[PDB]
Amino acid sequence: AASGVATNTPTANDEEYITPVTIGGTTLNLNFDTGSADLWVFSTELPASQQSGHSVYNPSATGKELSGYTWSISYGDGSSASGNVFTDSVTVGGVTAHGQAVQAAQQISAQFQQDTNNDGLLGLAFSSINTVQPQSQTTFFDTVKSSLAQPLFAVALKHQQPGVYDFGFIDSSKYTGSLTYTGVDNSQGFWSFNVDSYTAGSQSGDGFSGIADTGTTLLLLDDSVVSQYYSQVSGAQQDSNAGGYVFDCSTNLPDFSVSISGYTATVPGSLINYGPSGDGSTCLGGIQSNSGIGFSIFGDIFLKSQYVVFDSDGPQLGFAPQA
Numbered sequence: 001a002a003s004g005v006a007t008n009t010p011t012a013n014d015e016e017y018i019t020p021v022t023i024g025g026t027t028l029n030l031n032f033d034t035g036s037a038d039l040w041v042f043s044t045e046l047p048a049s050q051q052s053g054h055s056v057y058n059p060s061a062t063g064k065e066l067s068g069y070t071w072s073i074s075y076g077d078g079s080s081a082s083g084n085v086f087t088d089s090v091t092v093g094g095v096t097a098h099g100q101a102v103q104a105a106q107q108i109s110a111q112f113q114q115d116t117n118n119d120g121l122l123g124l125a126f127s128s129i130n131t132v133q134p135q136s137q138t139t140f141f142d143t144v145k146s147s148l149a150q151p152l153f154a155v156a157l158k159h160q161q162p163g164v165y166d167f168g169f170i171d172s173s174k175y176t177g178s179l180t181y182t183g184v185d186n187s188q189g190f191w192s193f194n195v196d197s198y199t200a201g202s203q204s205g206d207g208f209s210g211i212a213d214t215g216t217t218l219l220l221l222d223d224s225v226v227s228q229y230y231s232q233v234s235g236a237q238q239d240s241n242a243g244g245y246v247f248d249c250s251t252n253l254p255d256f257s258v259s260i261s262g263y264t265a266t267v268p269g270s271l272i273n274y275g276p277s278g279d280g281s282t283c284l285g286g287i288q289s290n291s292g293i294g295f296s297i298f299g300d301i302f303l304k305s306q307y308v309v310f311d312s313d314g315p316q317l318g319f320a321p322q323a
């Protein structure tokens with residue numbers, strides 16, 4: 001039975017986490033994203049000036065083309081990419097998927113053109129939302145799932161230190177105490193779960209739903225929750241140059257917690273100080289608006305405080321504080 005560990009590393013300010021993936025013999029640094037189901041890479045089909053600063057996949061060397069298939073995706077921050085599809089061998093932390101669909105980029109929006117921290121994305125949401133036309137394809141995880149010791153993966157994202165993606169096993173040394181599980185609703189293809197209530201510093205409120213999303217840097221919440229949080233942060237203000245609420249870097253921020261099936265998951269106020277806003281001398285908050293989309297996005301700010309188990313049996317998610 002297979003299992004493996006892939007080590008991830010945060011980029012500056014923990015903006016994204018990248019892990020090496022070997023595709024047909026070339027290793028690329030990909031952003032593992034539990035919020036989407038497409039494995040796409042910078043390729044030799046892009047314009048040569050866009051290939052610059054990246055490790056690229058050359059499909060003609062090892063790939064088997066799926067003639068006539070395309071993919072096209074749009075993410076939450078407006079970025080997008082599209083291209084064609086090949087099958088190849090994809091290895092992550094020593095686990096190999098043979099004949100994995102590899103989505104070679106033909107076009108990428110400006111956001112990706114300017115991000116040289118990754119060479120593409122490895123989706124880990126449910127395969128039901130993979131964008132490949134005319135027949136959708138399975139994610140790396142769905143491809144190898146039946147070969148792993150247990151059909152699950154687990155993640156520890158850390159603040160300015162390397163972390164891990166555990167495939168097919170749970171590493172009990174990565175969290176304190178025991179895991180608490182909650183059911184997942186995969187009807188929209190996401191790892192969606194319910195929280196029963198939340199506490200933002202001195203204020204507590206009713207529960208809501210959200211997705212466990214490794215691909216989003218911040219903790220995005222309903223505007224009512226964000227207002228409630230920052231009303232407790234002296235001098236907090238929104239700054240469109242920074243991307244949301246900012247405050248003095250020395251501020252004492254309140255903790256934020258959510259109650260999930262009996263377990264309190266706490267994000268300490270020191271993790272809510274994302275870093276320099278890059279707008280003078282303020283810091284950007286780790287909690288920001290979800291822009292009225294109707295569900296919360298439990299991104300990296302939240303994951304940096306937990307060890308999370310993504311279990312295809314249920315499916316369900318398990319949580320425990322990171323050791």
Ligand SMILES: COC(=O)[C@H](Cc1ccccc1)OP(=O)(O)[C@H](CC(C)C)NC(=O)[C@@H](NC(=O)[C@@H](NC(=O)CC(C)C)C(C)C)C(C)C
Pocket residue numbers: 015016031033035036074075076077078079213214215216217218243293297
């Ligand atoms: C279609 O599904 C997606 O787009 C999913 C789920 C989703 C749906 C709707 C709203 C938000 C989130 O996002 P995702 O795949 O994680 C997607 C992946 C990314 C690498 C383009 N993240 C996003 O689009 C989020 N973008 C981010 O978090 C960007 N981060 C920053 O701009 C750093 C700033 C915030 C300091 C990326 C550069 C990392 C936005 C939600 C804020």
Ligand SMILES: *[C@H]1O[C@H](CO)[C@@H](O)[C@H](O)[C@@H]1O
Pocket residue numbers: 001002003004149168169
């Ligand atoms: C993950 O689990 C497998 C299955 O037991 C081991 O063979 C592998 O070395 C790693 O511990």
Ligand SMILES: *[C@@H]1OC[C@H](O)[C@@H](O)[C@@H]1O
Pocket residue numbers: 005006007008162164
């Ligand atoms: C990344 O690869 C495997 C090991 O678990 C990890 O410690 C290393 O940094």
